[PDB]
């Protein structure tokens, strides 16, 4: 039902841990 969506690109993920992995992917450098 409820995903964890990327605030920056609006991609729906499962886990909040993946969002943190995801968001830092946008930074790239970190
Ligand atoms: Zn994203």
mmCIF file of C-alpha atoms and ligand atoms in Angstrom:
data_model
loop_
_atom_site.group_PDB
_atom_site.id
_atom_site.type_symbol
_atom_site.label_atom_id
_atom_site.label_comp_id
_atom_site.label_asym_id
_atom_site.label_seq_id
_atom_site.Cartn_x
_atom_site.Cartn_y
_atom_site.Cartn_z
ATOM 1 C CA UNK A 1 0.000 0.000 0.000
ATOM 2 C CA UNK A 2 2.364 2.707 1.232
ATOM 3 C CA UNK A 3 5.740 2.994 -0.523
ATOM 4 C CA UNK A 4 8.715 5.191 0.240
ATOM 5 C CA UNK A 5 8.929 7.638 -2.623
ATOM 6 C CA UNK A 6 11.987 9.602 -3.659
ATOM 7 C CA UNK A 7 11.349 13.233 -2.810
ATOM 8 C CA UNK A 8 13.617 14.335 -5.640
ATOM 9 C CA UNK A 9 12.452 12.256 -8.615
ATOM 10 C CA UNK A 10 9.239 10.648 -7.308
ATOM 11 C CA UNK A 11 10.213 6.989 -7.519
ATOM 12 C CA UNK A 12 8.251 4.623 -5.287
ATOM 13 C CA UNK A 13 10.496 2.330 -3.252
ATOM 14 C CA UNK A 14 9.767 -0.271 -0.585
ATOM 15 C CA UNK A 15 12.144 0.442 2.253
ATOM 16 C CA UNK A 16 13.218 3.731 3.880
ATOM 17 C CA UNK A 17 16.747 2.377 3.872
ATOM 18 C CA UNK A 18 16.539 2.254 0.107
ATOM 19 C CA UNK A 19 15.391 5.854 -0.003
ATOM 20 C CA UNK A 20 18.473 6.881 1.830
ATOM 21 C CA UNK A 21 20.542 4.818 -0.529
ATOM 22 C CA UNK A 22 18.502 6.389 -3.306
ATOM 23 C CA UNK A 23 18.717 9.999 -2.303
ATOM 24 C CA UNK A 24 22.494 9.828 -1.918
ATOM 25 C CA UNK A 25 22.502 8.422 -5.456
ATOM 26 C CA UNK A 26 21.203 11.829 -6.562
ATOM 27 C CA UNK A 27 24.112 13.491 -4.794
ATOM 28 C CA UNK A 28 26.455 10.942 -6.334
ATOM 29 C CA UNK A 29 29.418 12.361 -4.469
ATOM 30 C CA UNK A 30 27.812 11.247 -1.227
HETATM 31 ZN ZN1 LIG B 1 15.402 9.713 -6.972
#
